[PDB]
Amino acid sequence: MRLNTLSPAEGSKKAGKRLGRGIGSGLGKTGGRGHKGQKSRSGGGVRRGFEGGQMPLYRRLPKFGFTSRKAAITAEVRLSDLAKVEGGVVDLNTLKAANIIGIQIEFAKVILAGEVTTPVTVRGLRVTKGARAAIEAAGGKIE
Template identity: 40%
Template sequence: MTLRLDTLKANSGARRRKLRKGRGIAAGQGASCGFGMRGQKSRSGRPTRPGFEGGQMPLYRRVPKLKHFPLVNPKAFTVINVSALNELKPDSKVNLDSLVKEGLLTSPKHPLKVLGNGQLKVKLNVQASAFTASARSKIESVGGTCEVLT
């Protein structure tokens, strides 16, 4: 006999008849159909939503609050410290493009953020998307300006 789609059949005993519930005591699952007498799980429809743990904070809401879960939409910046800006000319305009031209940055994929590590000795007009508080204070203490780009 050849194996064809129209001759396919399940093995004997693989498919059992559906259990007909609520058809009397003799049927085995009569009256309450194996759901017991009362309570939430005996009512019609789904007793609780998926993931419900009786009011306890469910697993799918607990887990992301633990450590080592990455941010979904993290903010990425191209960063530079104020100590690297000492090589620039005084009163010059500093932004992402000028830093690439000077060779201080090589791959400006993201917006510029200025960090406050080190000392600044040169007065500069800095344009960046973000500044740390220490970087802003160091730039302004020398007489420079900080302009936030949006």
């Protein structure tokens, strides 16, 4: 274990394509680019979603919907996070003290996503029908 004895793992370092360096490398004289077109030029290549000049798929199709501005301020609390809220009382503001939801969140929902184990107290949140049947199955009261 000296400085001249340390090796990488096998396959951890691939070499890297060196283009335009002769016949034996398999990358000479075109650089893997083929013959004369737009895509073999320096900087050539069309932009994203170009189809030729056919109407592109993201312009062939209709826009739909709107952004809610209430889905940005809501989050979901898995049941895995009901043990980390530091006090057994899941408020909105105590989920932020444990860095579970996010500081700009006004509404949280507790969903059935895994193993509530402890006496917990959800106050001021929404819970689902599965999560209500699991919090009370471990001895928890929802306000």
